[PDB]
Design a protein around this ligand. Structure first.
Ligand SMILES: CCCC(=O)Nc1nnn(CC)n1
Length: 284
């Protein structure tokens, strides 16, 4: 069923809440035993948000290999994403270790450091060229190279250095700085624009490791970003794009990380983004 028609049918009937609960009910349940070990309690921002053991990212050290991060592998779309929580004061070093070990080119950040008057994630990148950050626990150095601040998002060029081997890489930081504190954007225009900018950079492309995507928990806005990308890619690839079932893509993605898409408003916004993105691209 063409999703644009399914959309109006759900909208006119006002059943978004009822669709959303169906997804929650049918969503996969797998063990998260490593996340719940007592040694890992201060590596988790939220007690109800854990990576599944089968899909979790492992850090390459013998000490403690745990980070709150999951590999979403979309087989038919041929895209991989790492979804992770906003780094904590004591996991900033782990975060940059993961970026290094997985050979990621881009970090996508969908939240501001402070929202609703509380801290949503650590200040994990340098704000001034001449004030670089050193992560002593993981032996990495990070330097701000340049910053391009626009109305809806900022792009930063960073240099990440492995102080052990003195190799350096360029990492791009894509910061969506305009997601409102309550609800979802009214138009998906600026979110779609930001997705095309990430694609343009080559950060989503198979010659790199998977992109690292985060908000505060790594399931809500992060969910919306990778659901929309994968759905539009599938509409490009397949002979009938009206066949693409966003609810089926979401349930497939929820096999790899729990809770993707946190509200019925985020589900609706996901439909709108894909419906609008499908157009535009479609001949322009
Ligand atoms: C929407 C543009 C970016 C922005 O400043 N968002 C924001 N900051 N506080 N709020 C309260 C709902 N919403």
């Amino acid at each position: 069923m063409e999703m644009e028609k399914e959309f109006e049918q759900i909208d006119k009937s006002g059943s978004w809440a009822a669709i959303y609960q169906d997804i929650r009910h049918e969503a996969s349940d797998f063990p998260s035993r490593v996340a719940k070990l007592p040694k890992n309690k201060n590596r988790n921002r939220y007690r109800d948000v854990s990576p599944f053991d089968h899909s979790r990212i492992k850090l390459h050290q013998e000490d403690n290999d745990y980070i709150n991060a999951s590999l979403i592998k979309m087989e038919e779309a041929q895209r991989s994403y790492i979804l992770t929580q906003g780094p904590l004061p004591n996991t900033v070093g782990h975060f940059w270790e993961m970026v290094w070990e997985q050979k990621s080119r881009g970090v996508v950040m969908l939240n501001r450091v402070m929202e609703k008057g509380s801290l949503k994630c650590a200040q994990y990148w340098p704000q001034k060229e001449e004030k670089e950050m050193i992560f002593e626990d993981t032996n990495l150095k990070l330097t701000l190279i340049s910053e391009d601040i626009k109305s809806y998002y900022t792009v930063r060029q960073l240099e990440l250095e492995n102080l052990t081997t003195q190799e350096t890489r360029e990492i791009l930081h894509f910061h969506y700085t305009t997601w409102p504190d309550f609800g979802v954007p009214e138009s998906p225009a600026s979110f779609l624009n930001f997705l095309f900018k990430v694609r343009e950079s080559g950060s989503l492309s198979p010659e790199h490791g998977p992109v690292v995507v985060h908000c505060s928990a790594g399931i809500g806005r992060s969910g919306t970003f990778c659901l929309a990308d994968t759905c539009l890619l599938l509409m490009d690839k397949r002979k009938d794009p009206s066949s693409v079932d966003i609810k089926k893509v979401l349930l497939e993605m929820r096999k790899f990380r729990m809770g993707l898409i946190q509200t019925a408003d985020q589900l609706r916004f996901s439909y709108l983004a894909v419906i609008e993105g499908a157009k535009f691209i479609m001949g322009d």
